[PDB]
Amino acid sequence: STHYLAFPRASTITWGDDTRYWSWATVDFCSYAIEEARLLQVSWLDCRWSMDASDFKQDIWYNASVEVMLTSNASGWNVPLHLEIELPDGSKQESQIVLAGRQPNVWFKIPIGKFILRGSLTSGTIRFGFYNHEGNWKRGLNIRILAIQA
Amino acid sequence: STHYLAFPRASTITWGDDTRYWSWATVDFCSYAIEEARLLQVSWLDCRWSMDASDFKQDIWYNASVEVMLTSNASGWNVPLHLEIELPDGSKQESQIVLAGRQPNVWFKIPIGKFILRGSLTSGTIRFGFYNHEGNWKRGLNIRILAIQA
Numbered sequence: 001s002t003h004y005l006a007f008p009r010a011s012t013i014t015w016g017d018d019t020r021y022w023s024w025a026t027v028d029f030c031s032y033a034i035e036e037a038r039l040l041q042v043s044w045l046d047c048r049w050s051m052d053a054s055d056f057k058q059d060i061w062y063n064a065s066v067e068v069m070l071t072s073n074a075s076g077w078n079v080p081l082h083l084e085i086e087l088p089d090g091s092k093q094e095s096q097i098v099l100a101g102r103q104p105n106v107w108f109k110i111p112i113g114k115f116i117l118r119g120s121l122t123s124g125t126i127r128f129g130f131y132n133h134e135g136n137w138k139r140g141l142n143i144r145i146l147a148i149q150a
Numbered sequence: 151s152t153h154y155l156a157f158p159r160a161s162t163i164t165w166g167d168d169t170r171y172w173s174w175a176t177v178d179f180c181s182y183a184i185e186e187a188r189l190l191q192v193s194w195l196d197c198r199w200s201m202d203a204s205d206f207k208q209d210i211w212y213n214a215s216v217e218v219m220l221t222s223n224a225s226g227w228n229v230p231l232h233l234e235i236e237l238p239d240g241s242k243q244e245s246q247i248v249l250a251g252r253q254p255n256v257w258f259k260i261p262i263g264k265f266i267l268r269g270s271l272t273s274g275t276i277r278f279g280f281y282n283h284e285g286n287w288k289r290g291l292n293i294r295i296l297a298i299q300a
């Protein structure tokens with residue numbers, strides 16, 4: 001079950017405030033006003049949420065997903081989208097996904113990994129994010145939410 | 151727009167794990183499995199979410215609401231439900247709401263106040279919660295989510 005939803009306004013997105021690269025769209029999310037971060041085009045793709053370990057309970061496996069949609073004009077997804085969870089002790093969950101060829105205009109949830117807080121791992125920033133920093137142009141990915149489940 | 155939703159599994163609820171007082175129901179919320187915290191009866195009513203100031207951005211007014219529903223059998227809402235936001239620097243937003251006579255079986259969002267992080271208010275726990283500790287029995291309040299908006 002879902003403990004937190006973090007919408008993209010809570011994240012730090014490189015170029016996120018520059019309308020050449022990113023747009024923001026207000027939509028309803030089951031009675032809540034949310035803003036989708038809608039990627040027009042960017043080369044330095046980087047979206048990071050930061051939540052403190054103290055936000056979570058100990059000795060419980062949490063899994064995180066990012067819910068996204070490819071637009072009809074999506075391109076540049078032949079390069080891997082890197083998925084990362086970084087814990088405050090240094091450990092990273094690292095994985096990747098190649099989005100090229102996936103059906104556009106359908107919401108899908110990308111799992112970005114799992115963590116557990118044990119012992120005196122009580123506090124410190126946890127980073128949840130996705131990035132691709134290659135010189136190619138990523139286009140047409142809309143971001144709905146980070147979900148953290150246990 | 152909504153930056154975070156925090157579902158009651160992320161909160162600390164006094165007696166929350168005791169089925170004499172509190173039940174948990176699995177439901178779908180916008181394609182996310184969530185568990186409603188459904189108050190059968192309790193005297194020490196206390197629900198607290200704790201999120202770090204570092205989860206939020208500076209120099210922005212956030213407002214917080216708790217979304218709840220009264221059941222057909224709801225009672226003991228003649229006593230005030232205390233609403234609180236506590237910031238890590240000591241400041242508290244305190245308010246209260248008397249729920250007696252509100253329409254049952256309809257979701258409503260209780261505003262619990264607003265905060266802004268300024269200067270080097272960079273970090274530390276923010277508490278969002280509601281409580282009534284009086285010797286009377288509170289019954290039939292179902293809790294959906296904490297919402298933090300800016």
Ligand SMILES: CC(=O)N[C@@H]1[C@@H](O)[C@H](O[C@@H]2O[C@H](CO)[C@H](O)[C@H](O)[C@H]2O)[C@@H](CO)O[C@@H]1O
Pocket residue numbers: 014015021041042043044045133135
């Ligand atoms: C619109 C676009 O994506 N521009 C990118 C630049 O951002 C990128 O330059 C890097 O940008 C990062 C942002 O954190 C740092 O400023 C880094 O020092 C820069 O090299 C360049 C080169 O990768 O590609 C586009 O111009």
Ligand SMILES: CC(=O)N[C@@H]1[C@@H](O)[C@H](O[C@@H]2O[C@H](CO)[C@H](O)[C@H](O)[C@H]2O)[C@@H](CO)O[C@@H]1O
Pocket residue numbers: 164165171192193194195283285
């Ligand atoms: C089911 C129920 O509401 N029981 C309550 C007790 O919780 C309560 O005792 C207080 O409980 C709080 C819990 O944080 C502290 O332990 C406090 O020290 C206790 O006094 C009593 C008294 O208010 O009322 C019910 O029985």
